[PDB]
Design an enzyme around this catalytic site. Structure first.
Site, mmCIF file in Angstrom:
data_model
loop_
_atom_site.group_PDB
_atom_site.id
_atom_site.type_symbol
_atom_site.label_atom_id
_atom_site.label_comp_id
_atom_site.label_asym_id
_atom_site.label_seq_id
_atom_site.Cartn_x
_atom_site.Cartn_y
_atom_site.Cartn_z
ATOM 1 N N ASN A 76 -6.194 -6.728 21.297
ATOM 2 C CA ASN A 76 -4.171 -6.920 21.390
ATOM 3 C C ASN A 76 -3.501 -6.094 20.531
ATOM 4 O O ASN A 76 -3.837 -5.699 19.308
ATOM 5 C CB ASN A 76 -4.271 -8.252 20.748
ATOM 6 C CG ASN A 76 -3.029 -8.689 21.238
ATOM 7 O OD1 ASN A 76 -2.026 -8.341 21.487
ATOM 8 N ND2 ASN A 76 -2.879 -9.726 20.177
ATOM 9 N N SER A 127 32.634 48.030 -3.623
ATOM 10 C CA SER A 127 31.507 46.630 -3.594
ATOM 11 C C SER A 127 31.648 45.916 -5.287
ATOM 12 O O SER A 127 31.881 47.015 -5.975
ATOM 13 C CB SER A 127 30.348 47.733 -3.811
ATOM 14 O OG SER A 127 30.303 48.826 -5.033
ATOM 15 N N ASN A 160 34.149 45.138 6.771
ATOM 16 C CA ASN A 160 33.201 45.561 6.011
ATOM 17 C C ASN A 160 33.281 44.580 4.588
ATOM 18 O O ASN A 160 34.739 44.651 4.433
ATOM 19 C CB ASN A 160 32.941 46.919 5.860
ATOM 20 C CG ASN A 160 31.989 47.106 5.931
ATOM 21 O OD1 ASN A 160 30.648 46.325 5.134
ATOM 22 N ND2 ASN A 160 31.631 48.772 5.340
ATOM 23 N N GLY A 191 -7.822 -8.515 17.929
ATOM 24 C CA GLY A 191 -8.555 -9.679 18.583
ATOM 25 C C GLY A 191 -8.622 -9.065 20.370
ATOM 26 O O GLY A 191 -7.990 -7.715 20.041
ATOM 27 N N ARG A 197 0.788 -1.245 -0.117
ATOM 28 C CA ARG A 197 -0.007 0.164 -0.040
ATOM 29 C C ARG A 197 1.080 0.903 0.190
ATOM 30 O O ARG A 197 0.660 2.800 -0.485
ATOM 31 C CB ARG A 197 -0.908 0.571 1.168
ATOM 32 C CG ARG A 197 -1.932 -1.195 1.071
ATOM 33 C CD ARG A 197 -3.465 -0.876 -0.062
ATOM 34 N NE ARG A 197 -4.231 -1.117 0.315
ATOM 35 C CZ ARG A 197 -4.183 -2.753 0.248
ATOM 36 N NH1 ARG A 197 -3.473 -3.120 -0.710
ATOM 37 N NH2 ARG A 197 -5.686 -2.740 0.711
ATOM 38 N N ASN A 220 0.788 0.932 7.169
ATOM 39 C CA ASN A 220 0.679 0.188 6.051
ATOM 40 C C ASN A 220 0.716 1.170 4.381
ATOM 41 O O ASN A 220 0.675 0.963 3.777
ATOM 42 C CB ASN A 220 -0.951 -0.273 6.762
ATOM 43 C CG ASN A 220 -0.386 -1.351 7.581
ATOM 44 O OD1 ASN A 220 0.870 -2.159 7.873
ATOM 45 N ND2 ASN A 220 -1.870 -1.625 8.054
ATOM 46 N N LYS A 270 9.360 -0.793 3.781
ATOM 47 C CA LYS A 270 7.946 -0.158 4.172
ATOM 48 C C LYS A 270 8.566 0.730 5.645
ATOM 49 O O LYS A 270 8.890 1.765 6.147
ATOM 50 C CB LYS A 270 6.442 -0.532 4.782
ATOM 51 C CG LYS A 270 6.035 0.070 5.745
ATOM 52 C CD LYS A 270 4.918 -0.475 5.930
ATOM 53 C CE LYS A 270 4.833 -1.488 6.622
ATOM 54 N NZ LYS A 270 3.614 -2.400 7.681
#
Lengths: 428, 428, 428
Positions: free
Chosen positions: B166, B395, B374, B137, B15, B224, B22
């Protein structure tokens, strides 16, 4: 048999507090009414008669379908009046389905059930059971068979006990509808013509009304203010997110996922938080999408990894590409297999070569890059400019279009380029 | 006494629609099974017998523990069959605990209670009460004492009324388990060996089964498909967010907070919306985290302020540093006290001096910056490059590694540097 | 008549685990106590007596109001003790309202109802009905009239059945309060003076107590740890989002919307996911806000479109402006009609001309741009610098302040500018 759909957009949307007609407001990137139109086309409706009372110019401007038939409702005298305006276009043989432009989430599957349920010469009516019906027309059944619909105001005290209400969606033969619609009348407190009256007409004529029920209550919920629209937005998004998760697309947080359009997903795709998908997105197998990304009308190859806070629009990525974080792909961008786009990098109408990197602060415009090229940090193009295979570009290089650069060329930092460069020639 | 853990990863994850087994899929940055392994180590399990039926290569590739014992289940004949495969490795003295790789959120505290509850020569069984048990269960108790577990199919109509079910987690002596596991049989509709049968064996032998209950139902919920995984993700995250809030870490919006790893927080830390923390993050006192930030395996000094939409990976920030907005710190970055990193600025394997600013559009690579420096907007390094204390950079200055720059040096805008520069020497 | 407010900040905030006093912690960008102070000013309270027991320095440092009267509670002997400290400042004629600094969401409307309900020479008391009152003082009414408040510990078994509890907010004449407050006593297990005792005093004196109820339970909820604060944050935000939606402001996802301040919205404004608004924001008609934006103390013209992940602070945008994606506007930025700011572009104390574009990787500092100017990608200013109307700037141009550039000037790529440039003069 054959069918047509009547969509009603006559209702005026004052509570929206908008200049745009209510039905055009978007839900998941698509106008509400367009959701209804798209359902009608899936069902195979031959014609879609849209009934409007205001904002005609904007409606025609926005909505373009080959089978779209425009029906004016000069004044808003109620649903029954609106169906009268469209009645001339009904064909006798075709079944006519009645839908609303402010009910975007009606499901195609629920509508298919409604059609099957219609008795011949009769009516199929969508109904729902509410824990608290208030101000809702109540389905009245004798011996388990539908007999009519009772508005809440006219409701008796026993009828105010009925859980089943009227959705307003129904199906009837086209000829039958023309017969009942003629019999309608305005003698009532509001002065309106209520469509609900035809249900009693069918019972009086000995014809049967059969009710089906929607899967979700969202399918029949309609919008009258921005708040309800935002609610249906979240309903729609969460409905899509669950589907994608069960289909094997992992979403780190489904609540922070917005899909505006259609997604084609490979296997083992993973999408992090606050991703927005738009238009038509195609994702390959094992594609990763970083937190905050936005992808629109783009194709991503298998195993590509888009790092967080990247924005992609009409770009085409081959397999194994990586981009971001903070990458920005303008429309027409294209990456070849293995290409990397780094942070603070933009690309417009450009193609990056295979295994070619533009790691930093680089803008690429109307350009073509050869394979294995290295693009220096700060590289800028004043766009067309072309670069050969196995070129290296110095940090902060400027290239003035049209400049062609030879294969294997190596260029110095700070260089500014106005002429073309011969293959394998170093330039400074 | 001594203990070992059996983790079951045999269940096949169709799934999930994935090539990855998984149990390896992640929840909060860590594979589900690794959550279970980490619980087992906290409990002090001597060995962890992992039982797999598929994807062996990927499992060994991903999971590396000193005490990890790999047990193949050749075919998937059910939980009882799986425990048989691991039974030979059980020691007689040690208690054996049975866990599942698809149940990541089982709590260490609930497991400690389960161990105490085990009667000697008996079984301790984790159970839970569900408003609607269906296909579960049912615990069967006579005079308040457990007697067995009844699968739902075999359930009588009275037994279908029992709220207690369970979980599948249990504890038993290692020797006892080997005795019961031998007695198991496949004579049943499925042909499987159900582990639940040993509970009746204990009762028939006169040994007692004692049931404890989990604190939250999330602890016993298993995955799942991707949807359930995403649900447990949100459960886990919200559980961590409440803990952090009560511990004095402010979260502007807990729902938009994702922690993938371990956080060490000082006092008065504030974290805005949509922050993601990864690996091992250390935050000082009065640290601020802007909206949308991502921090991985990084240390932030006291009073640092990270502005919004900044991305930090394996960086080391001293106190009083500020960065962002839109700052990006590659691994190995380091800031000294008072340093500022501005927007659209990247740093890889670099150190910024104390009170040193790189405010704009600057990339720093394999570089070391002196204090009070700087850094001009647009400064770029084509990496190693070093700069002295009290340097100013014009710059759009480019520095070609290896370039060393003297203390007090001042550099002109647009300059491109290939040689080293003497102390206190102006350069253009 | 006239009124004053007593706000209680005496409660010590150990569970906050903070150095900052509890009441100063923020909810929606504003300290909790400031919510209460702001309510008091709306109601027109003449004075606001704030009663504190700790963190005096921080409280005066943070909170500045003309009518703010500071009252020390030397030791924390309970609400009744605190009101005694402020009692001398009560005026006989004025009604005195009792509020709490840890109850930020008390509504002004609910307080107006409380004042009307106060019988003369009597008490108006805010009360609420809880499905489960536990540890809450229970309102005791005989023949439908209030008679007193029963602490839960002293509660009889019948009194533990009463749904109505005490909020702690009440209104009484200023003189009456001084009379009752004198009668208070510490003879009880805690040794505290409980304010609740005055309610019985009024009944014994023959005066009447009238109870009103809040609209929402959030209005009366108080904060003792960061978690409850985060909960009220979400309550407040969702309350604002619904109001904005019904007012015609569309929010794509209301849960991912944070407003910290005051919003003035035109019609047909649309705000996408994860937007944060701060300070005082003004939005024109048909303004669009991209996902993830942050706007603070800024004005956006009609029809402006802010693209996603843009950050704006104290900027002034005229109509038709566009900015972003990844745009950054420092304080003092200003755009004229039609101006575009592109990705990775910053602006500080600068104005962009009408129809003027700075599309890429450009920093603008202390600058003024003429209309129809084009700013090259990579342009940087080392700030004041001025540019005339209809100037073009080459890619990666640097301008050293102070540089003035003439109208119609055209500048070459890579140029670096230190002098001024004559009108209509090409420069390279």
């Amino acid at each position: 048999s054959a069918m047509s759909v009547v969509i009603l957009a006559a209702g005026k949307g004052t509570r929206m507090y908008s200049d745009l007609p209510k039905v055009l407001h978007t839900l998941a990137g698509k106008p509400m009414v367009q959701h209804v139109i798209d359902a009608a086309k899936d069902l195979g409706a031959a014609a879609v008669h849209l009934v409007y009372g205001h904002g005609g110019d904007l409606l025609r401007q926005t909505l373009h379908e080959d089978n779209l038939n425009w029906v004016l409702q000069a004044e808003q005298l109620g649903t029954g009046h609106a169906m009268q305006q469209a009645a001339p276009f009904f064909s006798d043989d075709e079944d006519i389905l009645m839908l609303y432009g402010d009910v975007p989430l009606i499901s195609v599957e629920t509508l298919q059930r409604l059609r099957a349920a219609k008795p011949q010469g009769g009516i199929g009516l969508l109904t729902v059971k509410l824990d608290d019906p208030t101000g809702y027309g109540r389905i009245t059944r004798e011996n388990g068979q539908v007999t009519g619909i009772v508005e809440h105001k006219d409701a008796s005290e026993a009828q105010r006990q009925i859980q089943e209400i009227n959705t307003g969606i129904l199906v009837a033969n086209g000829a039958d509808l023309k017969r009942w619609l003629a019999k309608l009348t305005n003698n009532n407190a509001q002065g309106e013509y209520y469509i609900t009256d035809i249900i009693a007409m069918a019972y009086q004529e000995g014809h049967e009304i059969v009710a089906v029920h929607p899967q979700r209550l969202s399918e029949v919920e309609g919008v009258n203010n921005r708040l309800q629209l935002a609610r249906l937005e979240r309903v729609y998004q969460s409905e899509q997110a669950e589907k994608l998760l069960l289909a094997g697309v992992m979403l780190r947080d489904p609540a922070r996922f917005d899909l505006r359009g259609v997604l084609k997903h490979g296997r083992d795709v993973e999408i992090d938080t606050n991703v927005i998908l738009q238009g038509h997105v195609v994702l390959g197998d094992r594609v990763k999408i970083g937190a905050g990304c936005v992808i629109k009308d783009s194709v991503i190859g298998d195993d590509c990894e888009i790092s967080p806070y990247s924005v992609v629009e009409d770009a085409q990525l081959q397999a194994a590409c990586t981009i971001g974080p903070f990458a920005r792909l303008r429309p027409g961008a294209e990456l070849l297999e293995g290409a990397h786009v780094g942070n603070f990098v933009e690309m417009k109408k450009a193609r990056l070569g295979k295994g070619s990197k533009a790691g930093h602060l680089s803008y690429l415009g109307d350009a073509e890059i050869g394979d294995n090229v290295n693009i220096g940090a700060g590289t800028i193009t004043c766009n067309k400019t072309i670069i050969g295979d196995d070129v290296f570009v110095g940090s902060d290089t400027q290239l003035v279009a049209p400049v062609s650069v030879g294969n294997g060329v190596t260029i110095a930092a700070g260089t500014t380029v106005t002429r073309n460069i011969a293959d394998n020639e170093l330039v400074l």
